[PDB]
Amino acid sequence: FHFPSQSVSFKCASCSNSFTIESTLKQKEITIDICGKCHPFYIG
Amino acid sequence: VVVKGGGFTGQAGAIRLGIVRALLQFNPELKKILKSKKLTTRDKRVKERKKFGLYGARRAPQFTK
């Protein structure tokens, strides 16, 4: 048996853009400190 | 009561003696109760002069053997 994991919202945590990726479905709209598109090491 | 110098407990003892002396001169029979309770003037209880070679007043560093 496989436990279902469905999309979790991720649109604004430190910037204004992100892609909706699936995670644990027991919670929705969780915030993270920094993502890829606003990472100072990512671009600079 | 007006004091000059000394710690609060020392000032307390000073005003103790002042109060008792003024009471005694106020009325002689007060003397009697001063002998009844034996709470009386100074017990000459003051910091003794510490000596050379002693870190305190009665303290030697320690004796090695």
């Binding site: 990726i21 699936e22 995670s23 993270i32 920094i34 090491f41 | -």
Partner: protein, 175 residues
Amino acid sequence: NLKAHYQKTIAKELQKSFAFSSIMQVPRLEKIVINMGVGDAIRDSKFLESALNELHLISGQKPVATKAKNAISTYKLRAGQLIGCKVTLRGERMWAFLEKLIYVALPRVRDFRGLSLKSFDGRGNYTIGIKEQIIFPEIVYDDIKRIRGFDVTLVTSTNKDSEALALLRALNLPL
């Protein structure tokens, strides 16, 4: 997920970059393997159920452990006593894992400066070294006996490194 975006843009510019005029000779993604490489579960440790549940949560499919391929005489390991985990990834779960890692784990590292000089087999398959337990948004707060990383690797169709690196750059993995 991004497979629609992959076919939307990346495939055509990959075709245009290298002169081949074929829509499928460009490198493609096949599978991602997750291995745990357990070397601490010799005595009554947490025996991977912490790892089992965290890996099953990050990937809903059942993780499968593996036994020793030989008998190592420096421990009590003799062809058995299953260790580690084996998770093969394909379908929607390519992107499910890839975006989670690239945009949720790498910036989440305590300190990350990137490292990509030669991590290939000489045929274009890139290994990724996880550092800490907490790089996933979800994690069970039970402590593994030894805090460790995870073994993950990306495989490519082409046996060449330049095209695989170009595809990874198109996917924007930090170098």
